[PDB]
Coordinates of C-alpha atoms and ligand atoms in Angstrom, one line a residue:
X26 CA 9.7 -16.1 43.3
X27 CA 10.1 -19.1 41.0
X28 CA 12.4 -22.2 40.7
X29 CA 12.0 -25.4 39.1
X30 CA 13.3 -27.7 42.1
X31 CA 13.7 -27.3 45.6
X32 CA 11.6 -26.2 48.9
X33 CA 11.6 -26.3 52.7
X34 CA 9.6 -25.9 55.7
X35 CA 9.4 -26.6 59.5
X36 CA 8.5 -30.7 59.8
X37 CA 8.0 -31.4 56.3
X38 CA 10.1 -30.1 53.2
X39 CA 9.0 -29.9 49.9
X40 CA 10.3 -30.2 45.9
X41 CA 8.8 -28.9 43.0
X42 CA 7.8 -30.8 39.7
X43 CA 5.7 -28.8 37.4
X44 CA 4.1 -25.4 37.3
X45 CA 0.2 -25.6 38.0
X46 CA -0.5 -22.2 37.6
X47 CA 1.1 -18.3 37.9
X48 CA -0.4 -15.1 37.9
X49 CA -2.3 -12.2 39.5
X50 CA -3.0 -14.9 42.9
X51 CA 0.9 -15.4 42.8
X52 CA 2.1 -18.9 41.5
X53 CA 0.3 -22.6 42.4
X54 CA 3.5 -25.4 41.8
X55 CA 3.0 -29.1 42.2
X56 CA 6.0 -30.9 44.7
X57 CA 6.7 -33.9 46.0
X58 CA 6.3 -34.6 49.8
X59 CA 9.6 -36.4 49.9
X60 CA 10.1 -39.0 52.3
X61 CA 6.6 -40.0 51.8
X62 CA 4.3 -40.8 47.9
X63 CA 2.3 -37.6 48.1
X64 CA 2.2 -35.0 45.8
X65 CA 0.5 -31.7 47.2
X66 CA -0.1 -28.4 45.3
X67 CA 1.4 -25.4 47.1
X68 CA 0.7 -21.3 46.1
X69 CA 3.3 -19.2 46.8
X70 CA 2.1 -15.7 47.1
X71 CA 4.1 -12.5 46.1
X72 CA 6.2 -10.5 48.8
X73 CA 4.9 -7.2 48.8
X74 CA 3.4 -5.0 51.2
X75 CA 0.7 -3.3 49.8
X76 CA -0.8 -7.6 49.1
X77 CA -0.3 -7.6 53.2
X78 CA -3.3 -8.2 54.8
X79 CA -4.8 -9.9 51.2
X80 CA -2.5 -12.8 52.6
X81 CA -3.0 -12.6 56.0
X82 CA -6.9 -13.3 56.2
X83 CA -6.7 -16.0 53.5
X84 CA -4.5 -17.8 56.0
X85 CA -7.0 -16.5 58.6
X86 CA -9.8 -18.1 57.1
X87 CA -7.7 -21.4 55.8
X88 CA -7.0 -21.6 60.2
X89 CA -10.8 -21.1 60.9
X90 CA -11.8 -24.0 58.2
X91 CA -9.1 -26.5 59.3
X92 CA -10.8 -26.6 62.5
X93 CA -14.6 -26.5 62.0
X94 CA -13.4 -29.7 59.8
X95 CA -14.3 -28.5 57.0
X96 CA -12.5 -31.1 55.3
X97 CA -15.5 -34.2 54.3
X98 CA -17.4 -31.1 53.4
X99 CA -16.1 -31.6 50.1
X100 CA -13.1 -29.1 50.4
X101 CA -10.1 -29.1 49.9
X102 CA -7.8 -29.5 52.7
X103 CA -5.0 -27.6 53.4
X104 CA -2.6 -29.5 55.3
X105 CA 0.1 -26.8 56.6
X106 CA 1.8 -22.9 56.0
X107 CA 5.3 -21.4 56.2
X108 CA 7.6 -19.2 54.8
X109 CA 10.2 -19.7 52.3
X110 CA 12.2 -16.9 50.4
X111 CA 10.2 -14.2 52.3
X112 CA 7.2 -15.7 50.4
X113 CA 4.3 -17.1 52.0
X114 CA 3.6 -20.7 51.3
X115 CA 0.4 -22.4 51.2
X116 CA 0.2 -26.9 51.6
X117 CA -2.7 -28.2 49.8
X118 CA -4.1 -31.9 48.4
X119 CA -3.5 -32.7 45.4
X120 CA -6.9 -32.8 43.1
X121 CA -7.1 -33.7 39.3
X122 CA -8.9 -32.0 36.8
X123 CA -11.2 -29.3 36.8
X124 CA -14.6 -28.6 35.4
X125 CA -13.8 -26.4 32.6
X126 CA -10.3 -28.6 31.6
X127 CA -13.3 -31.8 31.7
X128 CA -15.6 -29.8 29.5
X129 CA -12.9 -28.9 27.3
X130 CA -12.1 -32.6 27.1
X131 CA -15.8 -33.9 25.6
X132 CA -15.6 -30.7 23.6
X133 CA -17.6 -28.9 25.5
X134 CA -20.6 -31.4 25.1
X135 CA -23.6 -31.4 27.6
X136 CA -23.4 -33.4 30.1
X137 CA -26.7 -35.2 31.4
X138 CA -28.5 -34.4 34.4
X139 CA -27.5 -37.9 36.2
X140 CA -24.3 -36.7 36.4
X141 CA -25.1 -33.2 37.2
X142 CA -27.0 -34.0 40.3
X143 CA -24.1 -35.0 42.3
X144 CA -22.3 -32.6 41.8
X145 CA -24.4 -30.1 42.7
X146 CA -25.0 -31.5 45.8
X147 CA -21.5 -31.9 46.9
X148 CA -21.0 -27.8 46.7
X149 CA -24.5 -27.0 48.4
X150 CA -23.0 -29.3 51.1
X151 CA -19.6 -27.4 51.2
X152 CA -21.4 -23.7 50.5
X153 CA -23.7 -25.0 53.7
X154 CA -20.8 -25.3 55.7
X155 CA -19.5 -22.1 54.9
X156 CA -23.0 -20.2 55.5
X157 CA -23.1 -21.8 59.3
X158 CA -19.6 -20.3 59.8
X159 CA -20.1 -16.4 57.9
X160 CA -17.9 -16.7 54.9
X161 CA -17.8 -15.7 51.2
X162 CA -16.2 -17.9 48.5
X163 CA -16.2 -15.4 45.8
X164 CA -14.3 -17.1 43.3
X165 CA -16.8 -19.9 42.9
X166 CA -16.3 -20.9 39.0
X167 CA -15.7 -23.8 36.7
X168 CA -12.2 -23.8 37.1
X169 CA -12.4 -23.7 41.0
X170 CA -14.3 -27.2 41.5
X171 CA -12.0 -30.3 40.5
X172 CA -12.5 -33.7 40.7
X173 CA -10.6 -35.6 43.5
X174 CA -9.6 -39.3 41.1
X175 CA -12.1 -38.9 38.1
X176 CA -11.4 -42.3 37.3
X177 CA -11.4 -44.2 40.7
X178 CA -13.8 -42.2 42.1
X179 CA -16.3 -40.9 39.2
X180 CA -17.8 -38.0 40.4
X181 CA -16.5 -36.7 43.9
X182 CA -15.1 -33.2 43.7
X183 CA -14.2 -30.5 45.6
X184 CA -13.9 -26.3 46.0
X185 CA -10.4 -25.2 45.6
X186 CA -8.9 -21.1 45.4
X187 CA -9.8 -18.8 48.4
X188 CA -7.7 -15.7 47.1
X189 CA -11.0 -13.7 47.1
X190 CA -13.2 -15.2 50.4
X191 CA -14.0 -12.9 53.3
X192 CA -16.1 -13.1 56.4
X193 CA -19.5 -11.2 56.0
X194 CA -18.4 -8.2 58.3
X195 CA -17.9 -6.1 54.8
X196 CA -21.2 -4.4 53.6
X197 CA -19.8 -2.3 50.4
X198 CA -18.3 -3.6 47.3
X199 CA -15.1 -1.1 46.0
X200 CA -14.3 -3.3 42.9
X201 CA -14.8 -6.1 40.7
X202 CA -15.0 -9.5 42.9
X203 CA -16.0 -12.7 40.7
X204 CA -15.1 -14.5 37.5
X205 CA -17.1 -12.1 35.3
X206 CA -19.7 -14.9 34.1
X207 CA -20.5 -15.6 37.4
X208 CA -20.6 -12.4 39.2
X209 CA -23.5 -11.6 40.8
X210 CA -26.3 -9.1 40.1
X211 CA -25.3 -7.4 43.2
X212 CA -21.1 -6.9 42.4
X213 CA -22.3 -5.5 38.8
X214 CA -24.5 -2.7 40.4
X215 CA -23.0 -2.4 43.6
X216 CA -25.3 -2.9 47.1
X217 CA -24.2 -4.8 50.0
X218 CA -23.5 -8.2 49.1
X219 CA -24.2 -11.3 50.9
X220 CA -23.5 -15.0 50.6
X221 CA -25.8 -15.5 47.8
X222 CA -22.9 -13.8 45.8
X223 CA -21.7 -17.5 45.5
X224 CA -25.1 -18.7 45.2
X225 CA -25.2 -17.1 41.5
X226 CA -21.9 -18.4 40.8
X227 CA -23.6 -22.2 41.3
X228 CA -26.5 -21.2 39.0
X229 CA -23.8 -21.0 36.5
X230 CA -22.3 -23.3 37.1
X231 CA -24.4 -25.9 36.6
X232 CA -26.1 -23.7 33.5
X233 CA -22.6 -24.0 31.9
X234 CA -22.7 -27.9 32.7
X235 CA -25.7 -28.4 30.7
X236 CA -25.8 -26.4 28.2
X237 CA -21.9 -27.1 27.7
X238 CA -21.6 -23.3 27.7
X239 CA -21.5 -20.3 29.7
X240 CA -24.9 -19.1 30.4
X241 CA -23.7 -15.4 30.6
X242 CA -20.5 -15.2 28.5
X243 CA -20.6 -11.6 28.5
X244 CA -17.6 -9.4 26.9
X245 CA -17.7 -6.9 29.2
X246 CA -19.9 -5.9 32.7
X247 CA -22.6 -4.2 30.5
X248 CA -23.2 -7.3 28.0
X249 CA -23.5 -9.2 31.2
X250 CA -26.3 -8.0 32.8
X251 CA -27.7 -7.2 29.5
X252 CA -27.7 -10.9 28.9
X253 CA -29.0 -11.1 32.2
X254 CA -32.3 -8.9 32.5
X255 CA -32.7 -9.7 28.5
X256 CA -33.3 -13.1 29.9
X257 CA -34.6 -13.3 33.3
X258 CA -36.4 -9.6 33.2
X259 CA -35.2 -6.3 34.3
X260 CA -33.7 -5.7 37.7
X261 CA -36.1 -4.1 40.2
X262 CA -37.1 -0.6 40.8
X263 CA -35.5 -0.4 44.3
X264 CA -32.2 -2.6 43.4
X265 CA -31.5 -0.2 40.5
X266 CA -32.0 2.6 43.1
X267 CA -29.0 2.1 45.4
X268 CA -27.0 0.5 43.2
X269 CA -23.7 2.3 43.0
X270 CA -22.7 1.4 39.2
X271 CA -26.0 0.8 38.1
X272 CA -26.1 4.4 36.5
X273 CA -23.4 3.1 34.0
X274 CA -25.7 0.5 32.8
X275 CA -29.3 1.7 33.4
X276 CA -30.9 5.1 31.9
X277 CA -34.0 6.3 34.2
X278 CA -36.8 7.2 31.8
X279 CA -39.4 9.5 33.2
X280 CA -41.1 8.9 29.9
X281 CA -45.0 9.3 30.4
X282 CA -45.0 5.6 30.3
X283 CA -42.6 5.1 32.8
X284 CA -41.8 2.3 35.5
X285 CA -39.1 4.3 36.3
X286 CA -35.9 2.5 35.0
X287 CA -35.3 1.2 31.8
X288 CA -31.8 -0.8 30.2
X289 CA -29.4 1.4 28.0
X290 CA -29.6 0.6 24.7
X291 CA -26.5 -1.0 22.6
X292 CA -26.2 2.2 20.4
X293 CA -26.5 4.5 23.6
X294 CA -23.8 2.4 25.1
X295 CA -21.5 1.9 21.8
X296 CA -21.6 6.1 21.3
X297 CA -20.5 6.3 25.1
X298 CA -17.6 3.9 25.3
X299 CA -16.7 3.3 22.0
X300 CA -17.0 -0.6 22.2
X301 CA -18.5 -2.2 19.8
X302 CA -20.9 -4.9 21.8
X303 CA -20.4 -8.4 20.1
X304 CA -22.9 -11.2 20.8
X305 CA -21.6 -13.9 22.8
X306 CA -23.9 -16.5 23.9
X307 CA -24.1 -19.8 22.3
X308 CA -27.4 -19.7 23.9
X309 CA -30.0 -17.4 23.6
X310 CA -33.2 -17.1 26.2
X311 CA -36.4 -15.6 26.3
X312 CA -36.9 -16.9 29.5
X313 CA -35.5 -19.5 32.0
X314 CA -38.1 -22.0 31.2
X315 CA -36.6 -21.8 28.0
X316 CA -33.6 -23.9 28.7
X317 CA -36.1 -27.0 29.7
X318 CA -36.1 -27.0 25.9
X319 CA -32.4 -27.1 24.8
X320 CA -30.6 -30.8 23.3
X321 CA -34.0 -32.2 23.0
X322 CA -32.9 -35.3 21.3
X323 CA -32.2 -38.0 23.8
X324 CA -32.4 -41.6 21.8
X325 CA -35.0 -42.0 25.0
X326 CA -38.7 -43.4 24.8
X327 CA -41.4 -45.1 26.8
X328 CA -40.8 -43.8 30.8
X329 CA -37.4 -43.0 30.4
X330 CA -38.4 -39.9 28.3
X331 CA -41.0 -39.1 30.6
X332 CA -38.7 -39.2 33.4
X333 CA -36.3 -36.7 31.6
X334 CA -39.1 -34.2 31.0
X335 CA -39.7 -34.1 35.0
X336 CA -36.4 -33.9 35.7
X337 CA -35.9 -31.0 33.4
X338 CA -38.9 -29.4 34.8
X339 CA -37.6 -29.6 38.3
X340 CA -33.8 -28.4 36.7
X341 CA -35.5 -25.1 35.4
X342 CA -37.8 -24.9 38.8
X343 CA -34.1 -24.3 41.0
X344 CA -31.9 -22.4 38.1
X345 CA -34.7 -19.9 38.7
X346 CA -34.7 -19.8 42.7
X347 CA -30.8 -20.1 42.2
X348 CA -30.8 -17.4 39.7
X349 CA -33.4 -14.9 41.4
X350 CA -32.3 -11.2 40.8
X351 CA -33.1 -10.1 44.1
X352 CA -30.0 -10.7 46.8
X353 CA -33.1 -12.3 50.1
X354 CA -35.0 -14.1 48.1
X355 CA -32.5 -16.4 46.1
X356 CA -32.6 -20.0 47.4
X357 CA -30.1 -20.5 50.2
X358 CA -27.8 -23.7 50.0
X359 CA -29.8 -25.3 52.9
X360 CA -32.9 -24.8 50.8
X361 CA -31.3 -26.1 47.5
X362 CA -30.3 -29.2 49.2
X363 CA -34.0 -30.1 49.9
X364 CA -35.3 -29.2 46.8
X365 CA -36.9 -32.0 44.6
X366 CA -34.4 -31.8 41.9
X367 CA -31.6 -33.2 44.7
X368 CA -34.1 -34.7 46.6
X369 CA -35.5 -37.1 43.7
X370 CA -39.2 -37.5 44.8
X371 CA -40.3 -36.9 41.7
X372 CA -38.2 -39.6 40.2
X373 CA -39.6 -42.4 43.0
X374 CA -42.7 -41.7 40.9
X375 CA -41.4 -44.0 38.2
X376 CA -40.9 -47.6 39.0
X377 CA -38.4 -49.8 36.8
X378 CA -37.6 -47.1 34.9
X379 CA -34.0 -48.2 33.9
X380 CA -33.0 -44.4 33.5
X381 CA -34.4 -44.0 36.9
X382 CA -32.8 -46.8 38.3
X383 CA -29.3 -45.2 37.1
X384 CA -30.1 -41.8 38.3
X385 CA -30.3 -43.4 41.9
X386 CA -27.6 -45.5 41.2
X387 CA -25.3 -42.2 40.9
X388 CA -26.2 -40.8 43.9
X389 CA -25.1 -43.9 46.1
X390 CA -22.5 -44.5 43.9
X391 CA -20.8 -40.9 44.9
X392 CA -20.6 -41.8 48.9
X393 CA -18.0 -44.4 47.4
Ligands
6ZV1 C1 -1.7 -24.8 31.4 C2 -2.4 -25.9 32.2 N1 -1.4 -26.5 33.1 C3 -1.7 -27.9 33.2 C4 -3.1 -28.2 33.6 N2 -3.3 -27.7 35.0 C5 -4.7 -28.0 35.4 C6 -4.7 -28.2 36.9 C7 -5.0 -27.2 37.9 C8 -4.9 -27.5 39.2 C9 -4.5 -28.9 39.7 N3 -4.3 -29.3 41.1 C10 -4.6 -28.6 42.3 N4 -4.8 -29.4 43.5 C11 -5.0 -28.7 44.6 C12 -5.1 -27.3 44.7 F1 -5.4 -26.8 46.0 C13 -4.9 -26.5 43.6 C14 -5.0 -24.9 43.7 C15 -5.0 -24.1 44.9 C16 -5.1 -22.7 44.9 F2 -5.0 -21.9 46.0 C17 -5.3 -22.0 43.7 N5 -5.4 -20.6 43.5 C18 -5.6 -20.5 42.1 C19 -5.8 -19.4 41.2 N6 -5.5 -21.9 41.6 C20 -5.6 -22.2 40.1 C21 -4.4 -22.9 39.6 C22 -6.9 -23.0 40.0 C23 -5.3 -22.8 42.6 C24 -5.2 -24.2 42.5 N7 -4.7 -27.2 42.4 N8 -4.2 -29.8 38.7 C25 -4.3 -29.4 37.3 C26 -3.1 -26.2 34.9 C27 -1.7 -25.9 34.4

């Protein structure tokens, strides 16, 4: 289906403007609510019965997060559903920009931890909601988290696709599942996946905001979590064990010096596939400390600078929890809320510090 003006439905009816988006999730058009000034985004998705039931339980869940209000937990709301052409039509609020689209505007340039902060806690907020009620984003990524008027108001935002969410009844992974530099450890090796799945995806996330650039931009599954353990050390022993894929990825050295699992190396994996492995990262890590140490130049000095080197401190302290290997003992989005870095104790530390004072001043400012 496609058409570049006209729609219907039951009370409201609906024309379209300009294309928003179109492929694999079916096609996202922006219309006008006429008799009314709103302009709402509506996905259309393809009429085919094999993509059944993938359409019924996104509605399914879209019913079970209209009520439960999720709305004011900073996500998007869908306002109604009905059918037009066969297809199956989806009535959604109309948000701005994106994250990636906003990073692509400043060049991809950092952006500062005061702005950072709010953000994060706006999707802990909406991930907390969606932990209390059993379901998986899955397609948590920069270009799924858009600011609601980033003009009139700076810094609210919100989640937005659902094509890949799904109640946590499902214990086995068949297939790929995530943006690929934000999968999780557990969709690359395969074990029964959990919530934290999105979790990952918000570690990042707010990586890619401040370095500007994806954390992980791996080419392909195997430079991922090569990135991954090359940084943040090797998977464990019993993770690599029950992992499904994690024989394409990981060799199992019973070398006399021998932990019992080692990474394949580029050649071994270049003479099996036939891929020449590229780097990719504009950022490369010995360690997740390491980023506290990345754009150290900040035209900062006396308390503000001080401030900034707790606050990075802190930063580091949850990427890690956020970015744990392990599935259990990642930081949960209750947890991540309380943390110091959202919490700001460690800035009350610091009085008058006028970069303090405007690190405070973005957190009330984002009620507004
Ligand atoms: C070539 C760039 N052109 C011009 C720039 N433009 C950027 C852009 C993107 C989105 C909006 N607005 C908006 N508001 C509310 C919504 F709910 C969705 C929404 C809902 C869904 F279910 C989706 N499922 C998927 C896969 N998408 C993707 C489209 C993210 C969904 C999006 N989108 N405004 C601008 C892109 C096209």
């Amino acid at each position: 289906l496609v058409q570049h003006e006209v729609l219907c439905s039951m009370k409201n009816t609906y024309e379209v403007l300009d294309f928003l988006g179109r492929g694999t999730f079916g096609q996202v058009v922006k219309c006008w609510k006429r008799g009314t000034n709103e302009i709402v985004a509506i996905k259309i998705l393809k009429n085919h019965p094999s993509y059944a039931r993938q359409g019924q339980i996104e509605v399914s869940i879209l019913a079970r997060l209209s009520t439960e209000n999720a709305d004011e937990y900073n996500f998007v709301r869908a306002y109604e559903c009905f059918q037009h052409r066969n297809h199956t039509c989806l009535v959604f609020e109309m948000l701005e920009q994106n994250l990636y689209d906003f990073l692509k505007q400043n060049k991809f340039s950092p952006l500062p931890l005061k702005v950072i902060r709010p953000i994060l806690q706006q999707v802990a907020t909406a991930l907390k909601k969606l932990k209390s009620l059993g379901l998986i984003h899955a397609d948590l990524k920069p270009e799924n988290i858009m600011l609601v008027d980033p003009v009139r108001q700076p810094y609210r935002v919100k989640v937005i696709d659902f094509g890949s969410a799904s109640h946590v009844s499902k214990t086995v992974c068949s297939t790929y599942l995530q943006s690929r530099y934000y999968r999780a450890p557990e969709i690359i090796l395969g074990l029964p996946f959990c919530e934290a799945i999105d979790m990952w995806s918000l570690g990042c996330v707010i990586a890619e905001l401040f370095l500007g650039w994806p954390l992980y931009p791996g080419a392909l599954e195997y430079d991922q979590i090569r990135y991954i353990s090359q940084t943040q050390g090797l998977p464990g022993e019993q993770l690599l064990n029950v992992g499904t894929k994690s024989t394409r990825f990981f060799c199992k050295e019973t070398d006399m010096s021998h932990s019992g699992w080692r990474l394949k190396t580029l050649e071994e994996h270049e003479a099996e596939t036939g891929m020449k492995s590229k780097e990719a990262r504009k950022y490369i890590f010995n360690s997740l400390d390491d980023v506290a140490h990345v754009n150290t130049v900040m035209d900062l000095e006396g308390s503000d600078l001080l401030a900034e080197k707790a606050d990075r401190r802190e930063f580091v302290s949850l990427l890690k929890k956020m970015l744990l290997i392990d599935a259990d003992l990642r930081i949960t989005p209750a947890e991540t809320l309380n943390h110091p870095f959202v919490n700001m104790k460690h800035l009350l530390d610091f009085p008058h510090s006028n970069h303090v004072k405007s690190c405070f001043h973005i957190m009330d400012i984002c009620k507004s």
